[model samples]
Target: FDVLENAENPKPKEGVGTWVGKDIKVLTSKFGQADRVYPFRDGYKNYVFKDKNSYYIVSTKREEIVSVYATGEKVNVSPLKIGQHSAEIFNHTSINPEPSFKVDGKKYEFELSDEDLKTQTLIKYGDIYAQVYSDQQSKKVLSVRFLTKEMLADIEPYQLNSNSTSEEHNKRPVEQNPNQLISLYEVTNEMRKLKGLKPLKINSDLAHIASNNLYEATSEFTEDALRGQLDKNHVTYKTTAQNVGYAFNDVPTLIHSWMNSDIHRSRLLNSKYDEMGGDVMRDYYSLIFLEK
Candidate 1:
């Protein structure tokens, strides 16, 4: 008789290490088909399987399973499991929350300890530690992976500078035609494209006056100077959250500088213009392409 096949008292290591290097077919055969597949920036994908109590995240790349996270109340990976509140983990482990970072403008906090050099979110309990990922807003535990202190020392902790200003962020080149007066239509099209939506019809009346003064400004140009250029052109635009179809208002001068700054461009793509806070105007200057 195969001892590992016993349903009530299965071998401890039976479910572990059985899916690595295996393709999707093997996984579906063992755990049934996933509910959805989330595509990441790279070739990486996440196969999400839902259960009555919780869900599972099976990360894959090149059709092979790389990591598995079982996030459910009944999951007994030992001490930590999903469905537990964030405070429960902190109280049980005696670890405090460290600096948090925003993902798409939502905050996530990580617990850190001085003993471990590795830069990863961790919940330490003597020699044993569990790498934890949680939704800070919901206060619900997302997932937990058991690891030894030795393993914790091998990995790097999460590296996000929460306090850093946009001025300190990395710079990237802007590749726009210097003489091109960026059409409101073009900006809407670009924003829509990022959200995986269809394009709006181009409007000729929405055109801004092309000026060589705006063309000479580099990515390093200050926001105030950029606004002055727009002021000179009498360019003023506001984007509202109401419109279902494309409509043109005046274009804010700051947008030209934002289009030039690599840092601001990234925030735009990520739909995190609110992260800019008072530095950039919401609705007036910071436009979200997606409908709320």
Candidate 2:
């Protein structure tokens, strides 16, 4: 329904992997200038070509290509394309996200985990690789690229909400003021009312701990961690509800994702919570509900 094409990125030729270990300049001469060039990191720079349809890793130290890949949906390679959807994610039925596959005699394998970016996907083949990012809500392909496993090793994990001082000072439970968005509070109450429950009130002390715990978190959040934090902070409560997630607008989608999850749905409608509050930090939506 929409058109998005960049002049800088064109599609590459039939086999892109043959360029590995060759002088990057030699390939550039045949393919012309790249559309985008990423800065050097760890003696290597990424050159994205043909509308990001192909990518090459070149070691600046010797000006030689390290790896290459092609991911454009139209630039198909056998049974795999980066644009393949979730139905048959790997696009082949035999192995179904196979631990490894082969062409003739060569070995092809992959390892996947949503450790950093939830929507990102990768496929490593020989000396080349690819990446695909999807829209979690719409279940549609947004962007994709195939690249070498070396590329993954080259990238560093993001240190989101990382401010060591905050963690150091929060060795014990720290209390923060209740400054959650009123819209969040209103929507939660309205959703509860729609589910035949009374509106939840705001507990300054509880909300404070919630906010403080949110600010202090460094690792991925968990309900048990929030419970421990609540106990450490000395909050008297019969039950607690916690949700750690990300959303485009967050307000509705975060709630929607929670409602759709059986585990979260149970607590969202647990009937025990009488106080609820939450706050957004960076891309994370943090919330804690309590029954007292």
Candidate 3:
């Protein structure tokens, strides 16, 4: 949620008051802090007043009072298959050529709408439900335009068919390569004892593992975390695919910024290597002596 940034001006502020615009005392046991009082607005409700008779009143805007019956279940999805020519899509009379989901020991089938075929892709393979598109001229996957169902469902039909070459203006691309090798030196306790220091040495393998783990955790969460928004079909300002939007073009710059920003890199380095003594006093002394 913090990803969305807001502008400053007559900035947003938190306020509290009674239903009649009068100041009232409020208490909350959770935060362990006294509730601060403020002026109330026209459309907002004030529920801070305590009822001496142990009664309460509920009030809200007109829009909140109106109720509409369920229109009916909205369409979930209409999957289809694409073979040969793109125009050949019209030839397929059945959307669910295969059976649909099973219920109560029986199989249920759903109709495929044209909107579904135009929007989604015909998946193949068991684990990897991906389709390959090749350019007639180049015979390559067309890294910029050729996309999987998940990726294609995110792009507009017009752009895929008409603007194959125009894809550079759209679509954000990112590359991630991990660096996991480094040098380390070994120190012996005898060498440390000569200088009245505790045993410590460079650990290259541990350092690399720590670095790899950190990168893996960050990369996995950042990329996979977008699935919720994608599944919700949210409209992004960049790509208008029903509910898809918000392309990750600056991912490289973002990763770089995240790595180099403030003390993150230093923390990662420290995780890779940190010296310690056998005793608490020795550890304290060793840190001071090492710094000096």
Candidate 4:
């Protein structure tokens, strides 16, 4: 209806509709600058770019794009058009809308909504995780979405899509076996014992704080921000240190990498800290140490 997106700049090398796992820097450089950015304060941001008919919701994690959403019209992840009735979207034999879908080499199964779609929902076909939205009264599809597995991994899934009828809070995925937390707890103590420092005890309170402090380890997070969070929770501590990391394998690989990093090694081996805690989610791990 108006000017095409990126009239002056080069067309995005990749369709904005399917940019999951792509780089945000290249998007800004080639797809045109975002009209506004909504910062979530957790190393994630929503880059809103206006299109001729639809608005682009480009969600980013650190530097990588994790999800792309369109809420109006235009573009082509599929031949699906805007303003189609719910029946039209659901009946299209070529585009079957299923409740959950699996991505290649990804452990977590994802869906458009944990609750029934009632017309809106997600379906995975290969690497593409997509869904459609409609107004509650009309049930006419008004928007389409694309998401990455990382979006589900890093952010709470319910927050990614919202329905007016069920508005309570976020639901975190349940780990199949949470005993892995004990493994993380053990790894920290074993590292300290090997270094001749008295093994740190796994204090529940400290572990709880460490779990909440996952975002604190990111470069963008500030000391004051962490201090404020700790104060709000009424956590008592002398001094605290944290380490954030990712390992594609086991807990040993996870801790061994930290043991080799100079600063992280110091935190792991320090005698000043007598308590510790943290969490592990598949490849991602965050740990915190406290002196009390």
Quantify all predictions' global Cα lDDT against the true fold: 0.38, 0.48, 0.22, 0.55
RMSD of 2: 15.7
lDDT value for candidate 3?
0.22
Clashing pairs in 1: 118-157, 119-156, 119-157, 119-158, 120-157, 236-250, 237-250
Summing lDDT over every window of 10 consecutive residues in candidate 1, give the lowest-scoring window.
1-10
**How many backbone clashes can be found in candidate 1?**
7
Give the local distance difference test score of model 4: 0.55
- The segments of candidate 2 whose C-alpha lies over 4 angstroms from its true place after superposition are 1-180
Per-residue lDDT tens digits of candidate 1, residues 1-292?
A: 0000000121124342345446867879966887766543234566766554444556576777755555444555445555456566545444434644343454444444432122124554333445555432344554554433222222223332455322112221131121112223333334334344454442221222112222342112344544454457554433211111111111212332343334443434444221111111111222222211
Displacement of residue 93 (Cα, Å) in model 4 is 5.0
TM-score of each: 0.32, 0.38, 0.16, 0.41
Give the per-residue Cα lDDT of candidate 2 at 71. 35
- Candidate ranking (TM-score, best to worst): 4, 2, 1, 3
RMSD in Å for all candidates: 16.7, 15.7, 26.1, 19.7
What local lDDT does model 2 show for residue 246?
A: 52
Compose the digit string of candidate 3's lDDT tens values, residues 166-233.
22243211211110010011112221222233434433333343333333433522323333333343
Poorest lDDT segment (10 consecutive residues) of candidate 2: 1-10
**lDDT by residue for model 4 over 26-98, one digit each (tens)?**
7798668887665443356667665544456677878788777664445554545556666665554334323
Ranking by lDDT: 4, 2, 1, 3
lDDT of 2 by residue, 1-292 (tens): 0111101112234454445556879867987886555433244555645532333323333666765533333444433344455445544322213233333444434344442134444444444544444445444443344444433333311122222111111111111111124434644554454446776887776667656766777445656767787888788888776756652222333444454455665666668788876765544566678899
